[PDB]
């Protein structure tokens, strides 16, 4: 099951799906929020060699995208223009309506070549690639992203 | 929620697309509205009672489950997650017969 955050009296707990708290109140879908948090915020190395070592190519797994409503300002974002030695593109073009991450202090734009032994580039630790309000399992070409993970919250209101 | 990350960012500089209200003039019209880069609002939320760090941990602990969901569905883009969570929230209380003075019935 998917976890859900409960903020009551400035306190956060995981909602127990087995338990039932009748005092919890959800009076509107505005009280439901999805939030993107940056791996940056967990202390991960942001230098280009470590970040690119966290990503890897794989075939056979169709990409998947899920939206999120709010995100975190990133100090470090990345934008990749990688080709194979034969000149062909390693990464697909951004789908319609997938724009770059909206708040980046530094955009690390990496160009070069690799073997690209796989149809899509995924995060080796299972994190997501955060774009303009869309999180994907794969990297799109020429499109600024942040590394991150998604939480779901009921805000008190 | 026990934060088990190597380090934590105590400050949350959040951006969102929900309007804050009191929209000035006719700026809601897409022609006169801002570009795609200026439709966001910002805010600063400090670490209170150890919330912020915990939130990050939550996201981490969510990831796995979320991935599994994305494996099951065939939607190229999945937007109906929050709505489904609300539907399950309602079914949890009112899905079956609500017996007064019962554990699965929230009445008075």
């Amino acid at each position: 099951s998917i976890p859900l955050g409960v903020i009551h009296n400035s306190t956060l707990q995981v909602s127990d799906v087995d338990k039932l708290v009748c005092r919890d109140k959800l009076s509107s879908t505005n009280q439901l929020r999805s939030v993107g948090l940056n791996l940056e915020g967990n202390g991960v190395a942001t230098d280009v060699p470590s970040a690119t070592k966290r990503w890897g190519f794989r075939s056979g797994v169709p990409p998947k995208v899920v939206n999120y409503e709010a995100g975190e300002w990133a100090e470090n974002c990345y934008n990749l223009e990688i080709k194979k030695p034969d000149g062909s593109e390693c990464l697909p073009a951004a789908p319609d309506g997938i724009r770059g991450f909206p708040r980046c202090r530094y955009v690390h734009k990496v160009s070069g070549t690799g073997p690209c032994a796989g149809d899509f580039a995924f995060h080796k630790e299972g994190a997501f690639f955060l774009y303009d309000r869309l999180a994907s399992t794969v990297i799109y070409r020429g499109t600024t992203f942040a590394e991150g993970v998604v939480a779901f919250l009921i805000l008190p209101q | 929620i026990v934060n088990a990350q190597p380090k934590c960012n105590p400050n949350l500089h959040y951006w969102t697309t929900q309007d804050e209200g009191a929209a000035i003039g006719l700026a809601w019209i897409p022609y006169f509205g801002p570009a795609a880069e200026g439709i966001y609002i910002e805010g600063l939320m400090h670490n209170q009672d150890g919330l912020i760090c915990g939130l990050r941990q939550l996201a981490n602990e969510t990831t796995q489950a979320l991935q599994l969901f994305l494996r099951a569905t065939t939607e190229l883009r999945t937007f109906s997650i929050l709505n489904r969570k609300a539907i399950d929230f309602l079914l949890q209380r009112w899905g079956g017969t609500c017996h007064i003075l019962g554990p699965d019935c929230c009445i008075e």
Partner: antibody
Amino acid sequence: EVQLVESGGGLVKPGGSLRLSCAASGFTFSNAWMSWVRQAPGKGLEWVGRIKSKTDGGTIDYAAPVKGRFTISRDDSKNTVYLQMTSLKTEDTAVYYCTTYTEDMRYFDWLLRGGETFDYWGQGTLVTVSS
Amino acid sequence: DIRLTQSPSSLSASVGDRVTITCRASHYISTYLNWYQQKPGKAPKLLIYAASNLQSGVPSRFSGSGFGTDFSLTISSLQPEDFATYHCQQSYSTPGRYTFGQGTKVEIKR
């Protein structure tokens, strides 16, 4: 719960040496970064030096008007840090404070920057240099 | 390397007023400031780490704000024990010569 005590301050003539000692108790000394910060009578606070823990390599850094004349060391078996002052000049007359960078604030730094947040401060000692 | 400039240099306000001190940085810094309280004759006491974060034990009237180059410290309602000189210090890089601000001394009005 946490307390630091500075000792060894006194009057020294310009060009002389002097040894300052900083005793700490109430925390994990071997995992915390130590730092010396001095305050002149009319110049406010001025950072002097920094020493890492034995985990991060224990590299030492000094200030620009300070390099080449001072030397920091640490003893983890006694939870003490020492500051040695050689070829001292009259501008170094100040109130010296010994500060600690606890392991808990390492955990709050998320961009992995070398700078530190000074957690706890000791009483401080007086170092006067005059002819 | 990095310059910090406080404002104002001296301040006089009454008990219960909203006090705000500004700390400006020369280079770019993402919430590495720290607010220290130093009472005369005693050692500086850490109040705020990073931005808007209160150290355990600090009363609720203290609050921080800001990012980037400008930062703000706010006391909602002054109290007699708050009379002290406050300093802002950056932790973005290895500390330089001007890493600590000159200081802002708050004075109580009666």
